[PDB]
């Protein structure tokens, strides 16, 4: 009988974390993983963030479901406080107990406050590094996660401009490697899979996977032994207009032609 979050990372066991997630999410979902943060010195606050196994229906609804539970002085204030979470990290459910903020704090405070603006900007790193954490911890859990929240995470490079590279590792897609609509192959896999003359990252920007994979542009390269990543997103071109280069390796939409398709054909 004690406030779970207020305890140390060691004083809470694995079971209690996953059990506690069911309270804050108003669900019975077990998180694939989490990170317990407690900060000391000037601004003392406990942040406790989880990664859900599946996407709620009301995640993409006309109503908000992104946000954390705001606690102040170990007293509940309000929930769905989304000012702590970015758009590409809107999938996170969790809580944050702030000792610094007033007890009479409300939603507009969190928006306009410079300290709380720094709070979001801090949590951005801990979630993102917790995403790659999950990607290295359990690839199959992260595969489920990416099928449920992958569309959200593709908004990444746009928000954290200078940090595009980190999300580029997190990006999972299909390809001419495997006919699976399952988003398996990352840019990590692709760079490892690259051969002689395939220094240019081949993608297809298409509205549907059916029309993407039915395109002759694939077979033009596939017969030569080139691998093209299959994007069936609605956000595909928007994201890929900032994904012009990664690692020094420049991207190519096969839906467009340049000197690369002159020399290759």
């Amino acid at each position: 009988a004690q406030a779970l979050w207020t305890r140390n990372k060691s004083e809470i066991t694995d079971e209690e974390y996953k059990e506690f997630y069911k309270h804050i999410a108003h669900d019975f979902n077990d998180p694939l993983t989490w990170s317990h943060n407690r900060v000391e010195g000037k601004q003392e606050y406990t942040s406790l963030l989880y990664i859900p196994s599946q996407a709620p229906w009301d995640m993409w609804n006309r109503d908000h479901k992104h946000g954390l539970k705001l606690y102040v002085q170990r007293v509940f204030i309000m929930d769905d406080a989304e000012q702590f979470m970015p758009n590409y990290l809107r999938f996170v459910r969790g809580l944050i107990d702030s000792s610094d903020l007033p007890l009479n704090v409300s939603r507009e405070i969190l928006q306009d406050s410079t300290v709380t603006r720094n709070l979001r900007n801090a949590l951005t790193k801990r979630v993102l590094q917790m995403l790659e954490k999950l990607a290295k911890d359990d690839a199959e859990k992260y595969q489920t996660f990416w099928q449920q929240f992958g569309l959200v995470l593709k908004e990444g490079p746009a928000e954290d401009f200078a940090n595009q590279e980190a999300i580029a590792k997190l990006l999972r897609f299909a390809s001419t490697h495997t006919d699976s609509s399952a988003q398996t192959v990352s840019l990590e896999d692709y760079v490892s899979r690259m051969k002689e003359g395939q220094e240019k990252i081949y993608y297809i920007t298409a509205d549907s996977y059916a029309a993407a994979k039915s395109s002759p542009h694939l077979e033009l390269l596939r017969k030569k032994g080139i691998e093209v990543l299959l994007l069936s997103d609605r956000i595909d071109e928007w994201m890929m207009n900032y994904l012009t280069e990664f690692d020094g390796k420049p991207f190519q939409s096969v839906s467009k032609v340049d000197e690369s398709l002159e020399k290759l054909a």
Partner: protein, 71 residues
């Protein structure tokens, strides 16, 4: 309804840190020429070269080398 997969209970992996960037989506994202740096190279697909005349342009038969004198 969470999948759980097999066990799920047992991470304790954590991984703590902070050394990245963040701004916001309102900036430059959309509208760019997605053909950056013309780079491509594969194995020889082999196209028709040398009709027979030996003197297309100068020497289609590579009459400059041994030219295959048959030796």
């Amino acid at each position: 309804k969470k999948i759980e997969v097999e066990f799920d209970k047992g991470q304790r992996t954590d991984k703590y840190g902070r050394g990245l960037a963040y701004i916001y989506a309102d900036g430059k994202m959309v509208n760019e020429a997605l053909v950056r740096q013309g780079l491509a190279k594969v194995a020889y697909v082999y196209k028709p070269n040398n009709t027979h005349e030996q003197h297309l342009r100068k020497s289609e038969a590579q009459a400059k080398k041994e030219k295959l004198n048959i030796w």
